[PDB]
DNA sequence: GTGGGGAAGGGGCC
DNA sequence: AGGCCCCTTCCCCAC
């Protein structure tokens, strides 16, 4: 729990200071070696490289199938079970992911 | 108008 | 203080 100077709002977590004043200037201090572009967090230049590297950790408990990230494993879970998770509860519509439900629900017209 | 890919942040655990 | 992983919303796209 600490507060920016920047925008002057409780960010928690304490090496998560110096991340979140990154947002405010820009700055992309962390650069791929290979390709020669830079990131302004670390964890997404190890994406980047899981990117050049091949590498396909994200394995399937079900049926084994592996995937780049990790979004495409979830991709993967609704396939085996619960296609349509979401719902609105006002019109009862369906909806396959949860920005897809606000995207029903930014309109809010059932409500 | 619907699905999805990727981006951009915030947080939890070690 | 920071790596590594998760989550979220949002832009923008082919269909
Ligand atoms: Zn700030
Ligand atoms: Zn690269
Ligand atoms: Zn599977
Ligand atoms: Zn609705």
């Known amino acids: ?3 920016c100077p920047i925008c002057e ?3 928690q977590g ?3 200071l110096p991340r979140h004043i990154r947002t405010h200037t820009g700055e992309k201090p962390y650069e791929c070696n290979i390709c020669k572009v830079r990131f302004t967090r670390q964890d997404k230049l ?9 590498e396909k950790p994200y394995l399937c408990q079900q049926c084994g199938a592996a995937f780049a990230h990790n979004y495409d494993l979830k991709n993967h879970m609704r396939v085996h079970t619960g296609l349509r998770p979401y719902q609105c509860d006002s019109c009862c519509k369906t909806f396959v ?3 897809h439900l606000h995207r029903h629900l930014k309109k809010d017209g059932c409500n």
């Open 1 to 3: 729990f600490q507060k």
């Open 9 to 11: 709002k409780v960010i």
């Open 14 to 16: 304490a090496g998560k």
């Open 46 to 54: 190890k994406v980047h490289m899981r990117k050049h590297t091949g």
């Open 97 to 99: 992911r949860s920005d």
